């Protein structure tokens, strides 16, 4: 009754999105046919936040799957839960984007966008009171990057008073499978800076090191990387999906986490005793973005504990980490660490701890991308492929300046005193 509309764009967005629905469907006891087969009834008290309810008590995800090529859309339909989605919500083209942000944003994605907004509008109109949107996508490709931010912009025009959240896979510091990723990511960041309320930054190199070093998967795959993300997306959305009152809707969470409108890029974390969890959740090696928190200060933090646990012990150890490392929390935002607890644990574990941090250390990620981008743009390398789709150079100059401005802002607040 405070509904959210989920959108997934491009290959990465759709594969991450697909398994996010696997995780939470199991948590709410929904089976691939859409029928509920659970034990408790807190699985359904807030089910309508992510599921439309239908005929004969079958719950359909309020999800819209978007890509410019049908391939990855076919695997989703072939997957374990491929059958649970409303078939009218598969909006796909045939041309693809060629790893080109311009194609996704301006030419190929332009032809397909109105069809997506048609589906979005139909979903939103069946919402007692729409809350906001969440998008999953990568920033290094063409569709989720170029078209994904086009959808965001069109969505904000029809729904300017609604919250726009994203889970955004960013370029990684050392690994890359495409040459023009800096152009795609920088252009998309400029969009997110302006048109999202909360973005969770994920990169595959950090996702991978957890899989290999921690979970000891000797040969990790995108499938393993995506299960980590999906488990984290379940964690960060626990308070939206189960009865609580800390960060219960998208707006309240944004009011508590975003002190300044542009600094809305978050570092997620996940773990795995009560003193054990709270130590891990704060460790560098549990962040899904490749930024070290001890290189900056937290402006705000949102910790979420799941399972049966002494809330007394949790409260006590949360305070011990804050007071133990007081130097890493801005002194001009009092009580900026909020903790929530949910009794529903994730499957496989019994006590989870998901971490959402708004640290100025995130500037390191925007500086990596900015250094890569300038190295190419100073020589205009590969630029003709973008101006050939109709773009102007200043559109790159503006994108570079804005992310560089974003970096100075993070540092301006990284040094502020009381």
């Amino acid at each position: 009754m405070r509904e959210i509309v989920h959108i997934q764009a491009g290959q990465c967005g759709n594969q991450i999105g697909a398994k996010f629905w696997e995780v939470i469907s199991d948590e709410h006891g929904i089976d691939p046919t859409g029928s509920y087969h659970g034990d408790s009834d807190l699985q359904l008290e807030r089910i309508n936040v992510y599921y439309n309810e239908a005929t004969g008590n079958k719950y359909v995800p309020r999800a819209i799957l978007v890509d410019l090529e049908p391939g990855t859309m076919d695997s989703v339909r072939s997957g374990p839960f491929g059958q649970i989605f409303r078939p009218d919500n598969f909006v796909f083209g045939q041309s693809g984007a060629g790893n080109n942000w311009a194609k996704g944003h301006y030419t190929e994605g332009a032809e397909l966008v109105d069809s997506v907004l048609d589906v979005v509008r139909k979903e939103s109109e069946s919402c007692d009171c729409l809350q906001g949107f969440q998008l999953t996508h990568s920033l290094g490709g063409g569709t989720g990057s170029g078209m994904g931010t086009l959808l965001i912009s069109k969505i904000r025009e029809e729904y300017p008073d609604r919250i726009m959240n994203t889970f955004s896979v960013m370029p990684s510091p050392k690994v890359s499978d495409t040459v023009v990723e800096p152009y795609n990511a920088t252009l998309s960041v400029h969009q997110l800076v302006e048109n999202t309320d909360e973005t969770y930054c994920i990169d595959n190199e950090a996702l991978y090191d957890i899989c290999f070093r921690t979970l000891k998967l000797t040969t990790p795959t995108y499938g393993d990387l995506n299960h980590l993300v999906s488990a984290t997306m379940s964690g960060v959305t626990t308070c939206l999906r189960f009865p609580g009152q800390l960060n219960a809707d998208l707006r309240k969470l944004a009011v508590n986490m975003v002190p300044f409108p542009r600094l809305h890029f978050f570092m997620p974390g996940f773990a795995p005793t009560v003193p054990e969890l709270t130590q891990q959740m704060f460790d560098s090696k549990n962040m899904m973005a490749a930024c070290d928190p001890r290189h900056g200060r937290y402006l705000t933090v949102a910790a979420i504990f799941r399972g049966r646990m002494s809330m007394k012990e949790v409260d006590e150890q949360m305070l011990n980490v804050q007071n133990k490392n007081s130097s890493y929390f801005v002194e001009w935002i009092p009580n900026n660490v909020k903790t929530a607890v949910c009794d529903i644990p994730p499957r496989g574990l019994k006590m989870s701890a998901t971490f959402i941090g708004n640290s100025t250390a995130i500037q390191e990620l925007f500086k990596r991308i900015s250094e890569q981008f300038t190295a190419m743009f100073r020589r205009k390398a590969f630029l003709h492929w973008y101006t050939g789709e109709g773009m102007d150079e200043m559109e790159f100059t503006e994108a570079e300046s804005n992310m560089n401005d974003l970096v100075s802002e993070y540092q301006q607040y990284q040094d502020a005193t009381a």
Partner: protein, 438 residues
């Protein structure tokens, strides 16, 4: 007999109101279905408990209360709870999206859309009143609705009911159970806007309530139900004089004349004792002089402050149960010899005392133990300004950087209202100093 209407605004206001009204029903013998066997005037009456309860021809007793929130999850519990039949749906008002811990959103954006239906539903209650005393307004400082919408309604109530009195029961923000980081903002803004419309406000810092429940009830992690049940006791002991025969505080006007010589300084400190755990099969009972002496220990106050470093302007002692005046004055004289109790030069050093022979009523299954004498003291001491100093300092640290201000400007409020509200608290902190300091 003059009637009082209670208005519960926001989540805290609603959930506290529902504990109070449950507690009123037990004290008066009213059952969940509104039937009061003890009431012999069927379908009417001029009794003192009628100040809070209406009556229908069918013999039901209906609280003179209105519950309002900007989202329906909380008020729905009232529509579904033990005491659902008590209220007619007209008294329960729901928006659909709340104020998102944003004062400006609850006061300006959403408040304007709903303020007027709320006033109609209030007027529906006032129309049933032969002479209406005024309003008791339960709300929180930190919520978006509790701070934003409450201040809007107070402004309107000062117009639709210009002469009637308004009392607040405010929940002051405490980080150990707080929901939002911007609660200092919402607290300063609603206090500034409400100050000149409240005749007397009883603040309850959730920190104090939280630590009492931990110390004296052995609750390792107090919940809202634990806090509200303790709160409703202190509330009930304050409103008892309006619901029972007596000659002290029988009128919302008396609360101000007895406790507030200065309009702006209308925040009396409440101290309550004894709070004893019901898990103790028995607790060797306490004296009048001991519970009375406990009224001057900061660990029993609703707001942690040091009255020793301020001055009193008024003090009221509200006893419940086996108490007689001679034992009270014995406790007072002996207590004045061992305590630091300095009144202002321009006021008499004295205590107004009220006694109600009915011992405190407890909720079955609660953590509070049935006692045979309890006392609540209401003292207007300048030491309560410590709570303003704490809030103002937190407000200052965040506002120096304009942290979170964009959320309020985005709702149509001007940055100036921040400075304006803070300057008002700066004046109030200083007026408290001219009074209670040399």
């Amino acid at each position: 007999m003059r009637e009082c209407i209670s208005i519960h605004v926001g989540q805290a206001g609603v959930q506290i109101g529902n504990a109070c009204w449950e507690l009123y029903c037990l004290e008066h013998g009213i059952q969940p279905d509104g039937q009061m066997p003890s009431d012999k005037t069927i379908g009417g009456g001029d009794d003192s408990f009628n100040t809070f309860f209406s009556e229908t021809g069918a013999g039901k007793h209906v609280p003179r209360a209105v519950f309002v929130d900007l989202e329906p999850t909380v008020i729905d519990e009232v529509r579904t709870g033990t005491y659902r039949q008590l209220f007619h749906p007209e008294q329960l008002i729901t928006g659909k999206e709340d104020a998102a811990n944003n004062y400006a959103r609850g006061h300006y954006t959403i408040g304007k859309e709903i303020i007027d239906l709320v006033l109609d539903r209030i007027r529906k209650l006032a129309d049933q009143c032969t002479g209406l005393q005024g309003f008791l307004v339960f709300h929180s400082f930190g919520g978006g609705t509790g701070s934003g919408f409450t201040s809007l309604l107070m402004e309107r109530l000062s117009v639709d009911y210009g002469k009637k009195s308004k009392l607040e029961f405010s929940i002051y923000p405490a980080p150990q159970v707080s929901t939002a980081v911007v609660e200092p903002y919402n607290s300063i803004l609603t206090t500034h806007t409400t100050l000149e419309h409240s005749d007397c406000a009883f603040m309850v810092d959730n920190e104090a309530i939280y630590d009492i429940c931990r110390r004296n009830l052995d609750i390792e992690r107090p919940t809202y139900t634990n806090l509200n049940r303790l709160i409703s006791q202190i509330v009930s002991s304050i409103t008892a004089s309006l619901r029972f025969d007596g000659a002290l505080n029988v009128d919302l006007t008396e609360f101000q004349t007895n406790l507030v010589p200065y309009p702006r300084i209308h925040f009396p400190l409440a101290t309550y004792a004894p709070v004893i755990s019901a898990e103790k099969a028995y607790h060797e009972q306490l004296s009048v002089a001991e519970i009375t002496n406990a009224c001057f220990e900061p660990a029993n106050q609703m707001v942690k402050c040091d009255p020793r470093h301020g001055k009193y302007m008024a003090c009221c002692l509200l006893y419940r149960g086996d108490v007689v005046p001679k034992d009270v004055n014995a406790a007072i004289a002996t207590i004045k010899t061992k305590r630091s109790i300095q009144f202002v030069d321009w006021c008499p050093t004295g205590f107004k005392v009220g006694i109600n022979y009915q011992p405190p009523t407890v909720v079955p299954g609660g953590d509070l133990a049935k006692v045979q004498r309890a006392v609540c003291m209401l003292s207007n001491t300048t030491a309560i300004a410590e709570a303003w100093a704490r809030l103002d300092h937190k407000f200052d640290l965040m506002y120096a950087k304009r942290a979170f201000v964009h959320w309020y400007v985005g709702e149509g409020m001007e940055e100036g209202e921040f400075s304006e509200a803070r300057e008002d608290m700066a004046a109030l902190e200083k007026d408290y100093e001219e009074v209670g300091v040399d």
